[PDB]
Symmetry: C3
Subunit: 147 residues, 3 copies
Amino acid sequence: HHKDEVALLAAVTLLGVLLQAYFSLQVISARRAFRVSPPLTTGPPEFERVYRAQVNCSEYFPLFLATLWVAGIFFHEGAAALCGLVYLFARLRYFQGYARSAQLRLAPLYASARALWLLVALAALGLLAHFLPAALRAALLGRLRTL
Amino acid sequence: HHKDEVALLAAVTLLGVLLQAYFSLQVISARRAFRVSPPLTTGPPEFERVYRAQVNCSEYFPLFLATLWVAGIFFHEGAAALCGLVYLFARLRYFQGYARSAQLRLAPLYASARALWLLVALAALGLLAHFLPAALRAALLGRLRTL
Amino acid sequence: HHKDEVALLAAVTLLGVLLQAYFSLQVISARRAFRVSPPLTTGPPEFERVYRAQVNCSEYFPLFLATLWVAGIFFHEGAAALCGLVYLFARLRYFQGYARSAQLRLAPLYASARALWLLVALAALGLLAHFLPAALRAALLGRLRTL
Ligand SMILES: CCCCCCSC[C@H](NC(=O)CC[C@H]([NH3+])C(=O)O)C(=O)NCC(=O)O
Ligand SMILES: CCCCCCSC[C@H](NC(=O)CC[C@H]([NH3+])C(=O)O)C(=O)NCC(=O)O
Ligand SMILES: CCCCCCSC[C@H](NC(=O)CC[C@H]([NH3+])C(=O)O)C(=O)NCC(=O)O
Ligand SMILES: CCCCCC/C=C/CCCCCCCC(=O)O
Ligand SMILES: CCCCCC/C=C/CCCCCCCC(=O)O
Ligand SMILES: CCCCCC/C=C/CCCCCCCC(=O)O
Ligand code: NI
């Protein structure tokens, strides 16, 4: 089985799902507190901030998953998982901040982006490591060629 | 190949994609019926309900995929696929209900959430089964130690 | 390792992540240019068009990933990757068009949908190829039976 090579990625993934669920329930709770009934996603500022925090997190969640898995498979499982943990924690802080004030969402936002780009960089390096040698070899061989 | 261990997950996944596509085309059709042109996502209640049904389904679709795959790999492929089928059916009913009335979206919504949490629980149990024995052993060994 | 069987899918995936990130930064830039501060996602038409382009791309991005991977695993890795590249290029053109005018988003939109349905069709054929023979055999055997 290849379960062993991906269990941490799977665990972080599940943690991310749980965190998103948490955000969703928080939005339903703001819908009750500030009396906003579906459909319609406009209301008091505090509701709009909670709603909006949830929407942004939802929009970024697939980016996180894709890169987490690519980085974890092509670069290193543990590093990718760590960045994922930091990312998710950063996102929890983003949601809480935004819920209190637009400005307080900002620090954890930046933290979440650094973690996410790190995941990207690891994904990119891992892919580069996979493709670049064969390509260079093929290029040298074609030059060779001469002969 | 590991295709055999994941083909049902892949089939349910594809079914989910198809269902989302269906939702999208239904939104374009409500855009024509109630005369709402892009951008701008406000209009009559019925349009806002169709739009909103589609948006919620879209937001939950990655949660579904992640857990489906984790549950299917770490717990049991068939069970995970079944829950996925129920989930997707529940989501189809959610979209149809919401399209008719906000209140009629509610029963299939609850059905979709139960299926989704079941997927989560299976994912969680499977991950627990993978990590917990090695951890307990390591802990016992460290205690041993004495000696 | 099975890295070799999926590296192109992973590369296209990473490219898609990068493209989404690009869209996000473009939205932040329209937020500055046309003075729209979070929360609140209403403003001048040009902002609403950029915002909306980003939202639609985000909503379709998981559909793309799912089908890309299924098609790439069950049908053919290279074909799936190609369709993915075309899709993503089409999406870049969609975002740029929409940013200039609602009508100019339309041609690349259609291009993106054709590529996406092609991915779907490849996913479907690959799954059909996997499941249909065993099913037919089982059915013939049950007929046999007689005897
Ligand atoms: C992993 C298990 C998931 C747990 C599901 C609990 S239900 C919560 C879910 N809440 C949300 O999506 C919040 C955001 C949503 N965009 C909204 O505006 O209501 C919902 O169905 N909201 C809208 C609705 O009531 O239809
Ligand atoms: C799996 C194959 C997918 C089939 C694609 C068909 S195109 C439909 C697609 N429709 C939607 O996304 C509906 C919801 C969207 N949020 C909206 O408000 O228009 C679209 O491009 N909508 C907005 C637009 O016209 O740009
Ligand atoms: C792969 C690496 C990703 C790079 C991240 C850069 S930050 C950009 C990000 N921008 C967006 O999401 C744009 C769309 C968003 N829906 C919005 O309305 O602001 C954001 O956090 N927007 C809202 C906010 O400022 O909180
Ligand atoms: C859409 C999100 C991305 C999904 C990608 C996951 C696909 C994984 C398939 C290959 C895994 C093979 C085992 C790992 C090999 C290794 O660690 O080198
Ligand atoms: C982002 C969504 C999650 C993607 C996860 C899929 C990754 C799968 C890689 C490993 C698969 C190896 C074969 C299955 C082994 C088994 O059934 O025990
Ligand atoms: C949610 C997005 C879909 C994730 C699916 C990826 C799962 C891949 C697991 C199996 C991969 C095994 C190696 C490939 C085998 C082959 O090419 O035939
Ligand atoms: Ni293998």
